[PDB]
Design a binder for this molecule. Structure first.
Ligand code: CLA
Ligand code: CLA
Ligand code: CLA
Ligand code: CLA
Ligand code: CLA
Ligand code: CLA
Ligand code: A86
Ligand code: A86
Ligand code: A86
Ligand code: KC1
Ligand code: KC1
Lengths: 162, 179, 176, 170, 168
C-alpha cells in the first residue's frame, strides 16, 4: 500500500498505527471507503458550519408553525430548535440516501465511485493522469475538512473564538 | 409398531426395563391400551387445567336440581357432583363412540382422523414419526399427571386450586401423613 | 448448504473481519451462535412489546412475597424483581429445554420441528425462510440491545418514555 | 370415484327402492341434489343453533320498517319477519351465486374451493371427507326437518322448548 | 403463464382496445400494474369498511398535535388529518417496501410470501387463485373509485351516507 491515493509528497504512506502491514486488500478498501465517507460529509460540514456562523439563512419560515430560519441558532443549538417533525425528515431522507441511492450499484472503477451510469459530469475527458490526482485532491480535501470540522465543535463547546 | 420404533423416543430408547415384551403380539395389545389411556388422560389433564382455573360456563348444568356450573368442585369430586341423569348422557355418548364411531376394539388406533396439510405424511415422513411419538409422549406424561392430580387431592384433602393457594407443595411439617 | 444463507441482497456475504476466509472451521458454531442469539432476541423483543403494553396475567407471581404480576416493572428491572426461588425455576426449566428438548450443542439448529411443523419442500423456499429467520434474528439483536441501552440512558422504560413523548434526543436534557 | 360415496359402514348401499338399478344414469343428478340438500340443511342447523343462542347482530336490519336484529323470532317465523325489499336482496344475490357464480348445473359439486381452500392429496382421505359431507348433510336434513316439525307442533321455539323444561313429549 | 391469468368465463379476454398484439411486450408491465393497482385498491376498500365501522385505535395518533384516533374523519379527508411527521413516516417506510423488500419494479408480483405462506403446488389451484387476486382486485378498483365519487358528490362519508336513508 505504498503508491496509491493516500501516498503523498509531504508524507508518503504515513501509517503510524498497526493497520495495514499485510496484503489484505479487503481491509484497505473498507478503510479507504470510510475515509472518503467521513471526508465527503465533513467537507459539507465545514461549509455547513461557516454559513450559520456568518448568519446566512434560508428566506424564512421553516414551518407553518411560526418558526423562521433566523430563529434557529447556529452550531450545536440548531439541533434543539429545529422542529421535530422536520428533524425526522432529515434523518429519513439521509437514511433514504444511505440505504438506496448512494452506492456501488453497478460497479465503479474505484472505491467511492457512486456514478451508477445515472449521473456523470464528465469523467471521460481526463488524461488518466488527472483522474487519480483529482480524486487524490478530494481525499486530501476531505482529509483536512474532518480535522477542520472537529476543530469547530471542540471549540464551540469550549467557547474559543476561531 | 415395533419396527418403526414408535414409542421408543430418544431419552430412553426402547424403554421396556422390566422385560414385558416377550413377543410381537403382546406389544400390539399394550400399545393399543397405552395410546387409548394416553388419549383419555390428556383430556383429563386439560380438564383439571380448565376446572382449577375457575373457567366455567354461565348458567345451570341442571336447572331442575338448581345446580349451577359454578358450584361444581374443580377437584376429584366434581364429576359426581353432576346428576346421574346427566352423566348417563355422558356415558351413553362416549359409549357410542367406543363401539361405533371410534371402536376401541381397533387395536391400531387409526380412526381416519386426518387434518390434511398439518399432517402430509406422504411427503414428509419425519412429521409422521414426530406426531406419532408426541401422541404417546404427551399421553404418557398426562397419564402420570392425572395420577399426580388424583393422589395430591387424596393425601391433602385440597384440590389443585386450593393447595396452590396455600402453597402446600411439601409433605414435611404439615399435619398430614407421618412426615 | 449453510455457508451461503445469512447472505441476502443489499450486501451479499458480509464479513468485514474476514473470518470466513481466515477461520472456516469455526463458522458452523458461529452460525449456531448467530441463530441462537437471533431466536433469543426475537422472543426478547416481542416480550418488551407485550410487557410495555401492560398485558399481565392476573394475581400474584409470589403470594408469600406479596408480589403481583403487575408489580413487575416492564423494563430491565423486571426479570430481577422476580424472587430468587422464582428465577431458579425459570433457569432450571430453560436449561432443561436447552440441553434435552432443544439441545443447543446441535449446531444446525434443527430439532425435529419444522417451520410450523412442516419441512419446507422447496430447497430455496427453504433458504428464503432460513434467511428470514436470520435477518429477523439479526434485526432483533439490535432491537433488544437498542431497547436496553435506551432505557438505562433515558432512565425510563418504554412505556414511561413513550407516555412522556421523550423521543427527540436533541432538545431534551441529555448529553449533547 | 363418485358412486362409492354414500357407503359408510352400517347399511352400506342402503336403498329400499332399487333406484340403483332402475335408472343408473339418473344418479349424478340425484347425488348433486343430495349434496346441495345437505349443504343447505347443514347451514340451516347451525343457523338454528346460533339464532336460539341469542347471538344477535347489534343493530337494525331495516330502520325504515323500525325492526331491529333482536326482535325477529329465532324459530320458523324468521324469514317471515323480514321485509320484502330485504328478501329481494337475498334472492337476487344468491341468483348470482346459483347460476353466475358456483352453480347448481355443475353436478360435480367441485367448483374451485376444495376443503378449506386446498385439495386433499390422499384420495382415501379425500373420499373419507366426501362421505362426511354426505353423512353430516344427510343427518342435518333429518336434523333441520325435525327442528321445525318440533316447533310447529309445540308452539315454542328451540329456545323456549329448552328453557321451559318441555323436552319429553309424554 | 401470465397471459391466461386474468381471463374468466363471462368476459373472456375482453380487449376493446386490442392491446394484446398491438404492443404485446408491454403486457408484462401492465399486468404488473393491474396486479399492483388491484392489491392497493382491495387493501383500501376493506380499510374503508373498517374506518366507517368505528374500530379506532383506543388512543392518540399525535399527542403533540392532540390528535386522537377518533379525531380523524372516516372518509376522503381522513388521509389529510395525518400530521406532517405522520406521512413522512409513511413514505419513509414504504420506500423500504417498494424498492427494497417488495420491489414494485419486479413485474412478477412474486415476492416469496405465497398465499398465506405456502406455495400452491397444484398448477390449476394456483392459476385459479391468481384469477381471484386479479378479479377481486378489478372489482375493488371500482370498489372505492365508486366510493370517493360517492363522497365528494354528496359531502357525507359512508357512515352517514348509510345512517341517512341516502342509499337510493
Ligand atoms: C475517517 C476515518 C479514517 C479511516 C478509516 C482512514 C483509513 C486510512 N487512512 Mg486516513 N486519515 C484520516 C482518516 C481515516 N483514514 C484523516 C481524517 C486524515 C487527515 C489527518 C488522514 C490522513 C491520512 C494520510 C496522510 C494517510 C492516510 C492513510 C490511510 C490508509 C492506511 C491506514 C492508516 O494508517 O489510517 C490511519 C488509521 C486511522 C485514521 C484509524 C483511527 C484509529 C484511532 C485509534 C482512532 C482514534 C484517533 C487507510 C485507508 C494512508 C494512505 O491512504 O496510503 C495509501 C496515508 O498515507 N490517512
Ligand atoms: C417533496 C415532498 C415533500 C413535501 C410535500 C414536504 C412537506 C413539508 N415539509 Mg418536508 N422535506 C422534504 C420533502 C417534503 N416535505 C425533503 C426531501 C426534505 C429534506 C430532508 C424535507 C425537510 C424538511 C424539514 C427540516 C422540515 C420540513 C417541513 C415540511 C412541512 C411544512 C411545515 C408543516 O409542518 O406543514 C410540510 C408538510 C417542516 C416541518 O416538518 O414543520 C414542523 C420542517 O421543519 N421538511
Ligand atoms: C396405559 C398403560 C400403559 C401401557 C399398557 C404401556 C405399554 C407400553 N409402554 Mg408405556 N408408559 C406409560 C403407560 C403405558 N405403557 C406411562 C404412564 C409412561 C410414563 C412413565 C410410559 C413410558 C414409556 C416409555 C418411555 C416407553 C414405554 C414403552 C411401552 C411399551 C413397552 C412394554 C412395557 O413396558 O409395558 C409396561 C407393562 C405393563 C403395562 C404391565 C404392568 C402393569 C403394572 C404392574 C401396573 C401397575 C402400575 C402402577 C399401579 C402405577 C404405575 C405408576 C407408578 C410408577 C407411579 C408398551 C407398549 C416403550 C415403547 O413404547 O417402545 C417402543 C418405551 O420406550 N412406556
Ligand atoms: C332429498 C335429498 C336426497 C337425494 C336427492 C338423495 C339421493 C340419493 N341417496 Mg340419499 N338420503 C337422504 C337425502 C337424499 N338422498 C336423507 C335425508 C337420508 C336419511 C338420512 C338419506 C339416506 C341414504 C342412504 C343410507 C343412502 C342414500 C343413497 C342415495 C342415492 C341412491 C338413490 C336413493 O335411494 O335416493 C332416495 C330417493 C329420493 C331421495 C327421492 C325422493 C324419495 C321420497 C319422495 C322422499 C320423501 C320421503 C319422506 C316423505 C321424507 C320424510 C323425511 C322425514 C321428514 C321423515 C341417491 C343419490 C345411497 C347412496 O348414497 O349410494 C351411494 C345410500 O346408500 N340415501
Ligand atoms: C335428527 C335427529 C333428531 C333428534 C336428536 C331429535 C330429538 C328430539 N325430538 Mg325430534 N324429530 C326428528 C329428528 C330428531 N329429533 C325428525 C326426523 C322428526 C320428524 C320430522 C322429529 C319430530 C319431532 C316431534 C313432533 C317432537 C320431537 C321431539 C324431540 C325431543 C324428544 C325428547 C324426548 O325425550 O323424547 C328430542 C329433543 C319432541 C319435542 O317435544 O321436542 C322439543 C316432539 O314433540 N321430534
Ligand atoms: C391501505 C390503505 C389505507 C390507508 C391510507 C388508511 C388510512 C388510515 N387509516 Mg386505515 N386501515 C386499512 C386501510 C387504510 N387505512 C386496513 C386495510 C385496515 C385493517 C387492518 C385499517 C385499520 C385501521 C384502524 C383500526 C385505524 C385506521 C386508521 C386510519 C387513519 C390514520 C391512522 C393510521 O394510519 O392507521 C393505521 C393504518 C393501518 C392499520 C392501515 C394498514 C395498511 C396495511 C399495509 C394494509 C395491508 C388513516 C386515514 C385510524 C383511524 O383514524 O380510523 C378512523 C385507526 O384507528 N385504519
Ligand atoms: C407514552 C404512551 O402512553 O404511549 C403512547 C406512545 C405514542 C407513540 C405517542 C402513541 C402513538 C402514535 C403512533 C405510534 C401512530 C402510528 C400509526 C401507524 C403505524 C400508521 C400506519 C400507517 C400505514 C398506512 C395507512 C398504509 C398505506 C398503504 C397502502 C395504500 C399500500 O398500498 C401498501 C402496500 O402494502 C400493500 C398494501 C399493497 C402493495 O401492492 C403495495 C404496497 C406494498 C405499497 C400512543 C398511541 O399515543 C401511545
Ligand atoms: C331455556 C334455557 O334456559 O336453556 C337451557 C337449556 C338446558 C339444556 C336446560 C341447559 C343445560 C345443560 C347442558 C346442555 C349440560 C351439558 C354440557 C356438556 C357439553 C356436557 C358434556 C359432557 C362430556 C364429558 C364430560 C366427556 C367425557 C369424555 C371422556 C372422559 C373421554 O375420555 C372421551 C373419548 O373421546 C376420547 C377423549 C378418547 C377416545 O379414545 C374415546 C372416548 C370416547 C372415551 C341450560 C344451559 O341450562 C340452558
Ligand atoms: C365499457 C367497456 O368496454 O369497458 C372496458 C373499456 C376500458 C375502460 C377501456 C377498460 C379499462 C381500464 C379501467 C377500467 C381502468 C380503471 C382502473 C381503476 C379504477 C384503478 C383504481 C385505482 C384506486 C386505487 C389504486 C386506491 C386509492 C385509494 C387509497 C390508496 C386509499 O388509501 C383510500 C382512502 O380512503 C382512505 C383509506 C385513506 C385516505 O387518506 C386516502 C383515501 C381517501 C383515498 C376495460 C378493462 O377493457 C373495460
Ligand atoms: C412442577 C410444578 C410446579 C409447582 C408445584 C410450582 C410451585 C410454585 N412456583 Mg413454580 N414454576 C414451574 C413449576 C412449578 N411451580 C414451572 C414449570 C415454571 C416455568 C419455568 C415455574 C416458574 C415460576 C416462577 C417465576 C415463580 C414460580 C413460583 C412458584 C411458587 C408460588 C408460591 C409462592 O411463591 O408463595 C410455588 C411453590 C414463584 C416463586 O417461587 O416465588 C418465591 C415464582 O416467582 N414458578
Ligand atoms: C353492498 C350493497 C348493499 C347496500 C347499499 C344495501 C342496502 C340496504 N339493505 Mg342490504 N343486502 C346486501 C347488500 C346491500 N344492501 C347483501 C349483499 C345482502 C345479502 C344477500 C343484503 C341483505 C339484506 C336484508 C335481509 C335486508 C337488507 C336491507 C337493506 C336496506 C337497509 C335500510 C332500509 O331498510 O331501506 C338498505 C337499502 C333491509 C331492507 O331491505 O329493508 C327494507 C333488509 O331487511 N339487505
Amino acid at each position: 500500500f505504498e503508491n496509491e491515493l493516500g501516498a503523498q509528497p509531504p508524507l508518503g504512506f504515513f501509517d503510524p498505527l498497526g493497520l495495514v502491514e499485510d496484503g489484505n486488500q479487503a481491509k484497505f478498501d473498507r478503510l479507504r471507503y470510510v475515509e472518503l465517507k467521513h471526508g465527503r460529509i465533513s467537507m459539507l460540514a465545514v461549509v455547513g458550519y461557516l454559513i450559520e456562523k456568518a448568519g446566512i439563512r434560508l428566506p424564512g419560515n421553516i414551518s407553518y408553525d411560526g418558526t423562521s430560519f433566523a430563529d434557529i441558532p447556529d452550531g450545536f443549538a440548531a439541533l434543539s430548535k429545529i422542529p421535530d417533525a422536520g428533524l425526522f425528515q432529515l434523518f429519513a431522507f439521509i437514511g433514504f440516501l444511505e440505504v438506496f441511492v448512494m452506492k456501488d450499484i453497478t460497479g465503479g472503477e474505484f472505491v467511492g465511485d457512486f456514478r451508477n451510469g445515472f449521473i456523470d459530469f464528465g469523467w471521460d475527458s481526463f488524461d488518466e493522469e488527472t483522474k487519480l490526482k483529482k480524486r487524490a485532491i478530494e481525499l486530501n480535501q476531505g482529509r483536512a475538512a474532518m480535522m477542520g470540522i472537529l476543530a469547530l465543535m471542540v471549540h464551540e463547546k469550549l467557547g474559543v473564538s476561531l | 409398531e415395533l419396527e418403526d420404533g414408535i414409542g421408543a423416543v430418544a431419552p430412553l430408547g426402547y424403554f421396556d426395563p422390566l422385560g414385558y415384551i416377550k413377543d410381537e403380539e403382546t406389544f400390539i395389545r399394550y400399545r393399543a391400551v397405552e395410546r387409548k389411556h394416553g388419549r383419555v388422560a390428556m383430556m383429563a389433564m386439560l380438564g383439571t387445567f380448565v376446572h382449577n382455573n375457575g373457567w366455567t360456563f354461565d348458567g345451570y348444568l341442571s336447572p331442575s336440581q338448581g345446580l349451577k356450573f359454578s358450584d361444581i368442585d374443580s377437584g376429584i369430586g366434581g364429576l359426581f357432583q353432576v346428576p346421574p341423569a346427566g352423566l348417563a348422557q355422558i356415558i351413553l355418548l362416549c359409549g357410542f363412540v367406543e363401539l361405533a364411531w371410534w371402536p376401541a376394539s381397533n387395536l391400531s388406533g387409526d380412526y381416519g382422523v386426518r387434518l390434511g396439510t398439518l399432517n402430509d405424511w406422504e411427503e414428509q415422513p419425519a412429521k409422521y414419526y414426530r406426531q406419532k411419538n408426541a401422541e404417546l409422549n404427551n399421553g404418557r406424561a398426562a397419564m402420570m399427571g392425572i395420577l399426580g392430580t388424583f393422589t395430591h387431592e387424596v393425601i391433602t384433602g385440597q384440590n389443585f386450586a386450593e393447595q396452590a393457594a396455600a402453597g402446600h407443595f411439601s409433605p414435611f411439617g404439615d399435619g398430614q401423613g407421618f412426615f | 448448504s449453510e455457508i451461503e444463507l445469512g447472505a441476502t441482497e443489499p450486501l451479499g456475504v458480509f464479513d468485514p473481519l474476514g473470518w470466513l476466509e481466515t477461520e472456516p472451521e469455526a463458522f458452523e458454531r458461529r452460525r449456531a451462535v448467530e441463530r441462537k442469539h437471533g431466536r433469543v432476541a426475537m422472543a426478547a423483543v416481542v416480550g418488551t412489546i407485550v410487557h410495555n403494553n401492560h398485558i399481565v396475567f392476573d394475581g400474584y407471581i409470589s403470594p408469600s412475597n406479596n408480589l403481583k404480576f403487575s408489580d413487575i416493572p416492564t423494563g430491565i428491572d423486571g426479570i430481577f424483581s422476580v424472587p430468587t426461588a422464582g428465577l431458579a425455576q425459570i433457569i432450571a426449566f430453560l436449561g432443561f429445554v436447552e440441553l434435552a428438548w432443544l439441545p443447543a450443542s446441535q449446531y444446525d439448529g434443527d430439532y425435529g420441528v419444522g417451520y410450523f411443523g412442516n419441512d419446507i419442500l422447496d430447497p430455496e423456499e427453504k433458504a428464503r425462510k432460513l434467511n428470514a429467520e436470520l435477518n429477523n434474528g439479526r434485526a432483533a439483536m439490535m432491537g433488544i440491545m437498542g431497547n436496553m441501552v435506551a432505557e438505562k440512558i433515558t432512565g425510563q422504560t418504554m412505556y414511561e418514555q413513550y407516555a412522556a413523548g421523550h423521543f427527540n434526543p436533541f432538545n431534551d436534557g441529555e448529553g449533547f
